[PDB]
């Protein structure tokens, strides 16, 4: 039929502001789930709930459909569902990648096509923590951030964002880039610039 479990509908109602599950709702929901906004697991949540844009409110039907399918009616249940996705974020490279690429689409401001470098950098700092499955030399990550700042790269395109994961797995160190990187491959042009910059600072 049509009625979701009362307990699930109470959860929705609890969070909404002036009839909408808005930005303030999602923040409170994350808080009550027991997370900080810095926690990558919050991206699994958004993805699980099918957010396309953070600016747009989450529809009731969408909120209810999603939890009904996870067998959740209570915060406790939802905590358990996210905890599980959080483990999968750390352990399953394919899932991490998907969530990584998804991050970009949410970071995008409305009406933009590239993300601002500062926002991008802030998110790269989250994704490249040693607990996560793509590990590289700290100096290399720092050199990348520094490059973007020093050379005036104020925006990051989807291609650059998506490709950087393969890049870092393929060359975990500055020296590996120096010794193996080929400019005539099909890397994003900004990655070619990064190589030249590193080549200079030898």
């Amino acid at each position: 039929g049509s009625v979701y479990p009362k307990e699930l509908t109470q959860v929705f109602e609890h969070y909404i502001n002036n009839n909408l599950f808005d930005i303030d709702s999602l923040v409170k929901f994350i808080e009550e789930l027991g997370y900080n906004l810095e926690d990558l697991a919050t991206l699994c949540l958004a993805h699980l709930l099918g957010y396309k844009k953070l600016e747009e409110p989450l529809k009731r039907e969408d909120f209810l459909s999603t939890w009904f399918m996870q067998g959740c009616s209570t915060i406790s249940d939802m905590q358990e569902c996210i905890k599980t996705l959080d483990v999968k974020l750390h352990e399953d490279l394919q899932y991490f990648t998907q969530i990584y690429n998804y991050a970009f689409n949410l970071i995008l401001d409305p009406n933009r096509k590239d993300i601002d470098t500062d926002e991008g950098i802030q998110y790269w700092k989250l994704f490249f923590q040693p607990e996560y499955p793509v590990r590289m030399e700290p100096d290399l990550l720092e050199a990348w951030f520094r490059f973007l700042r020093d050379e005036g790269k104020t925006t990051i395109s989807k291609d650059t964002w998506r490709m950087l994961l393969l890049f870092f797995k393929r060359y975990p160190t500055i020296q590996k880039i120096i010794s193996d990187y080929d400019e005539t491959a099909a890397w994003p042009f900004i990655i070619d610039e990064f190589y030249e910059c590193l080549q200079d600072q030898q």
Binding site: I23, L26, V27, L37, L43, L54, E55, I107, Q122, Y123
Partner: peptide, 12 residues
């Protein structure tokens, strides 16, 4: 969800 906090500051 850092973007979410940014959006809060913009709305406030």
């Amino acid at each position: 969800m850092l973007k979410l906090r940014q959006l809060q500051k913009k709305k406030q």
